[PDB]
């Protein structure tokens, strides 16, 4: 769509109306818009750095800055055909944001597919209210999930307590297991202790599933019988 002119210049056209006398009374917005001008450039703006990983956008390494033989043993003595092509488009293409955590988020849930069955709430409470010390995994205001493992891993890396991401990730994994075993034992023992004092529950999870299966299976029986009778004819 053509860059529109008549939405951002309402003040100028209104002032022409007022000066000519076509409009008698000044509108209520007139002085407000006069004191707060709209942005009227509507330009494409280049970018020179990827915000996420800090990679510089728009630098060409020269042959002088590659004085050493490449992996195939050949020196670089002249520019290649990629260096000679103007790369202005990269300056305007919105950069792809990248985080190592995402590679480490994919791994965790490949190693623990049943951690995907733990429901997650994506509704944020307030990102500014978070004050976490990742020296430990449990945090007040957070659940225990894969992100706890990964944030602890990143903490361990940035403090150089481990040099390799693999070892930090494994350490975080074992702390996560330590906490999960405690939680599951807490749940089981809480239920056991509740039953030992006369807690009378109604439908459990197993009975819930049984009743839903029954609801589905009744309709399935009816359809099967109807289809068999129809097929016979």
């Amino acid at each position: 769509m053509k860059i529109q002119t008549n939405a951002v210049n309402v003040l100028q056209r209104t002032s022409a109306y007022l000066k000519s006398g076509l409009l008698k009374e000044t509108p209520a917005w007139y002085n407000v818009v006069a004191s707060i001008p709209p942005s009227t450039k509507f330009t494409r703006e280049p970018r020179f750095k990827n915000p996420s990983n800090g990679h510089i956008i728009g630098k060409l390494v020269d042959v002088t800055e590659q004085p050493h033989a490449n992996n195939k043993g050949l020196y670089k003595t002249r520019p290649n055909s990629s260096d000679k092509r103007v790369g202005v488009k990269r300056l305007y293409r919105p950069p792809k944001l990248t985080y190592v955590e995402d590679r480490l988020r994919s791994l965790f849930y490949k190693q623990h597919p049943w951690e995907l069955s733990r429901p997650k709430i994506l509704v944020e409470n307030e990102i500014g209210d978070e004050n976490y010390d990742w020296s430990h995994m449990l945090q007040i205001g957070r659940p225990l999930d894969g992100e706890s493992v990964i944030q602890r891993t990143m903490y361990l890396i940035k403090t150089k307590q481990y040099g390799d991401m693999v070892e930090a990730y494994d350490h975080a994994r074992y702390e996560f297991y330590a906490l999960r075993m405690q939680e599951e034992t807490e749940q089981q023992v809480a239920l056991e202790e509740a039953e030992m004092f006369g807690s009378l529950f109604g439908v459990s999870a197993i009975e819930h599933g049984i009743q839903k299966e029954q609801e589905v299976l009744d309709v399935w029986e009816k359809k099967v019988v109807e289809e068999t009778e129809l097929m016979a004819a």
């Binding site: 915000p51 996420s52 944001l97 985080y99 955590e101 995402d102 988020r105 994919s106 791994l107 965790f108 849930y109 490949k110 190693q111 623990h112 597919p113 049943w114 951690e115 995907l116 069955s117 733990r118 429901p119 997650k120 709430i121 994506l122 509704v123 944020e124 990102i127 999930d145 894969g146 992100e147 944030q151 390799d164 693999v166 990730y169 994994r173 074992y174 297991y177 999960r180 075993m181 939680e183 599951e184 034992t185 749940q187 089981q188 056991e192 039953e195 030992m196 459990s204 999870a205 197993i206 009975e207 819930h208 599933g209 049984i210 299966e213 029954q214 299976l217 029986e221 099967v224």
Partner: protein
């Protein structure tokens, strides 16, 4: 900066995946992260994704692939079923150790299905529970197969099937049985193989 917060944001916490949302093969374990909402946010179609989920969705759980698509929709399914399987396993009490002391993608131990340790007894008002009894459904004439708590298990009999089995036939699944879950291991594919016995 905004980039660091985005890397730490809740959407970023969900690992990228594009596995089909309508898989019709074999399901051994969850493939998609279940997304939940509170009643208050559901009333306003708010799920923490980009776009408001349609009002038709009354359930509080979904799985999704893409926040937005060329079709101007979010690719999602209003299902959170795999959590009820896991919890049902936790109700059974049968346990399944790599949880004790460059990257390997293989499932580690149980893949988060259960963290219960092997040797423990369930006290009850009767007394120590000797064996775990669970309702189930015999599936088909075959070790038979039984649908128990969201898992398909192998049924072994004391002596032989009763007359109800062949009396009903392919409608045997309509009636509920009681099973003793003998044991539960997990194989390399990530599938749990419970062995039970009819009672």
């Amino acid at each position: 900066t905004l980039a660091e917060l985005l890397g730490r944001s809740r959407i970023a916490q969900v690992a990228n995946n594009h596995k089909p949302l309508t898989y019709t093969g074999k399901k051994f374990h969850p493939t998609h992260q279940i997304i939940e909402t509170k009643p208050s946010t559901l009333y306003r179609q708010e799920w923490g994704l980009k776009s408001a989920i349609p009002s038709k969705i009354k359930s509080r759980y979904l799985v999704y692939n893409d926040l937005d698509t060329l079709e101007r929709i979010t690719t999602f399914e209003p299902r959170g079923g795999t959590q009820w399987n896991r919890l049902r396993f936790q109700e059974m009490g049968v346990p399944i150790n790599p949880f004790f002391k460059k990257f390997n993608t293989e499932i580690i131990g149980t893949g988060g299905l259960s963290y219960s340790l092997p040797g423990k007894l369930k006290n009850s008002p009767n007394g120590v529970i000797q064996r775990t009894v669970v309702p189930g459904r015999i599936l088909n004439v075959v070790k038979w197969l039984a649908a128990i708590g969201g898992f398909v298990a192998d049924v072994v009999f004391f002596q032989s099937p009763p007359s109800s089995f062949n009396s009903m036939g392919d409608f045997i699944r309509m009636k509920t049985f009681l099973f003793e879950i003998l044991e539960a291991s997990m194989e390399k594919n990530g599938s749990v193989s419970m062995h039970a016995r009819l009672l």
